Design a protein around this motif. Sequence first.
Motif, mmCIF file in Angstrom:
data_model
loop_
_atom_site.group_PDB
_atom_site.id
_atom_site.type_symbol
_atom_site.label_atom_id
_atom_site.label_comp_id
_atom_site.label_asym_id
_atom_site.label_seq_id
_atom_site.Cartn_x
_atom_site.Cartn_y
_atom_site.Cartn_z
ATOM 1 N N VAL A 84 48.552 16.945 31.681
ATOM 2 C CA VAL A 84 49.356 18.064 32.655
ATOM 3 C C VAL A 84 50.144 17.842 33.804
ATOM 4 O O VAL A 84 49.774 16.402 34.318
ATOM 5 N N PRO A 85 51.255 18.516 34.017
ATOM 6 C CA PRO A 85 51.889 17.887 34.986
ATOM 7 C C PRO A 85 51.100 18.124 36.419
ATOM 8 O O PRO A 85 50.922 18.534 36.732
ATOM 9 N N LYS A 86 51.033 17.170 37.442
ATOM 10 C CA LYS A 86 49.504 16.793 38.395
ATOM 11 C C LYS A 86 50.235 18.448 39.808
ATOM 12 O O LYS A 86 49.511 19.425 39.912
ATOM 13 N N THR A 90 44.404 31.221 27.031
ATOM 14 C CA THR A 90 44.624 30.903 27.895
ATOM 15 C C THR A 90 45.993 30.106 27.270
ATOM 16 O O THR A 90 45.166 30.046 26.090
ATOM 17 N N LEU A 91 46.665 29.264 28.171
ATOM 18 C CA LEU A 91 47.811 27.907 27.662
ATOM 19 C C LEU A 91 46.930 26.472 28.279
ATOM 20 O O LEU A 91 47.622 25.567 27.768
ATOM 21 N N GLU A 92 46.280 26.484 29.469
ATOM 22 C CA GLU A 92 45.777 25.732 29.338
ATOM 23 C C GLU A 92 44.599 24.727 28.797
ATOM 24 O O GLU A 92 44.027 25.208 27.933
ATOM 25 N N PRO A 93 44.762 23.797 28.582
ATOM 26 C CA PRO A 93 44.751 22.956 27.402
ATOM 27 C C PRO A 93 43.278 22.697 27.336
ATOM 28 O O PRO A 93 43.356 22.785 25.842
ATOM 29 N N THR A 132 44.235 26.063 38.262
ATOM 30 C CA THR A 132 43.835 26.114 36.449
ATOM 31 C C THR A 132 44.365 27.067 35.561
ATOM 32 O O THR A 132 44.685 27.617 34.555
ATOM 33 N N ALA A 133 43.713 28.764 36.762
ATOM 34 C CA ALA A 133 43.727 29.401 35.348
ATOM 35 C C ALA A 133 45.385 30.215 35.831
ATOM 36 O O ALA A 133 45.952 30.599 34.378
#
Length: 479
Positions: free
Chosen positions: A153-155, A15-18, A163-164
């Motif tokens: 992240v942008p809220k 994933t690219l979710e930090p 998230t996913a």
Amino acid sequence: ERRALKIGVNGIPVTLEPINAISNVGPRIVNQIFDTLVVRDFFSNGAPGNGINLMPSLAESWERIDDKSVRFKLRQKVMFHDGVEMTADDVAYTFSSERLWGPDAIKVIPLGGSYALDFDEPVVEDKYTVVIRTKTPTPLTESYMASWMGRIVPKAYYKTLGTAAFGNKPVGTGPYKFVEFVANDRVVIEANDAYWGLKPTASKITYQLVAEPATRVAGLISGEYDIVTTLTPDDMALINSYPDLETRGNIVENFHMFTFNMNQPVFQSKPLRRALALAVNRPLIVQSLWMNKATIPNGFNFPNYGKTFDPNRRAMEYNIEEAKRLVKESGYDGTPITYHTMGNYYANAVPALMMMIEMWKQIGVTVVPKVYAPGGAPKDQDSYMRNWSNGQWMTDAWATMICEFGPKGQVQKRWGWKAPAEFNDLCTKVSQIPDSKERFDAFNRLRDIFEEEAPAVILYQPFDVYAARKDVHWRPISF
């Protein structure tokens, strides 16, 4: 003037979710898509590459107000890649109970809880001013914001997608913006000329999975790749014999290890785990496969811990007499035990495993390799031994002994290590006391328990090598 960079990598993150991208292969990509409030100056106070003075980034300034609260004044007119201005709301959401450290957040950022400081809800004072708070005192807030947990992240967009889905279409404030993600294959990012900071110097970056290191070396030699990662010292002579190419190698603040699924009956108790640990001849592995350049730490103890590093701690034990005695005690039937490895995702993973199989054969244990391709990871019920690494991401021993191995971590929760009560009570204690002889001695007791229990076995800190064209003067692979 601005070239498209082609980077041959050892792996692509899931994933690219930090936060969920935290791995050996995700930061190099997500650090270009996202920014943090503050950054570490790796060359401060004469440091040759791993210095710690904090410098502005998305926060122009910051003030610790008290032992629980830090005010950040944010840069203005910073744009996310979709044209939405970054504000204190976004920073507050990044470290909110809802997204990061609350109960529902744990379900989608499984490790948000274990890697979070003891946060309280951030306070937005105005559009560009946020206060990051902790429920108990901690000096680590500011340096944590420079870490891989601090990417903003942008809220609105993140909350809307969840998230996913956000991890498949990330939007950040960084110098490169998302283009494409093909699982187990590639990520493509492109220059963000609306970046608030220095203009990007590459037009686009493609991170291409090239599983085998020899194929990465051959791709750099042929010009297919501009930069390749995760090589070993043995590759350096050949690459450096090409005047247009070069290598860079350094000891990294990360240790390779092997670990166990302690939900499995064969590894529910320490004797056989410790037996396998005491039979590892680390100097032989380092001499055979690393040209004596990999470093063996004196326990779960690294110099970047600062006040909680012990320079006089004893070496980790090598005792095959005791290992043989513990195999017999365990009642080990002789049944082969699998050791799962995703090829050489970790440099020298397969050759080190083959050397360790011989060492374990010499103490009566039969270990069989199970080499798998990216995306072919076994289900937890099918995993027994496996390799792993931990990056030492704080200037404090809290990371990774407490993060990963403490009572809130994945080693106990997901992988079933039933740690002694003194260990979990000491983890609790160190997290509520300041730097002192009590805290320093407490981490040494935790290290002693770690070695006796062997929930994992530290191998060494790798001498990480990358290679690149000499005419490629910027390399987004995060040393």
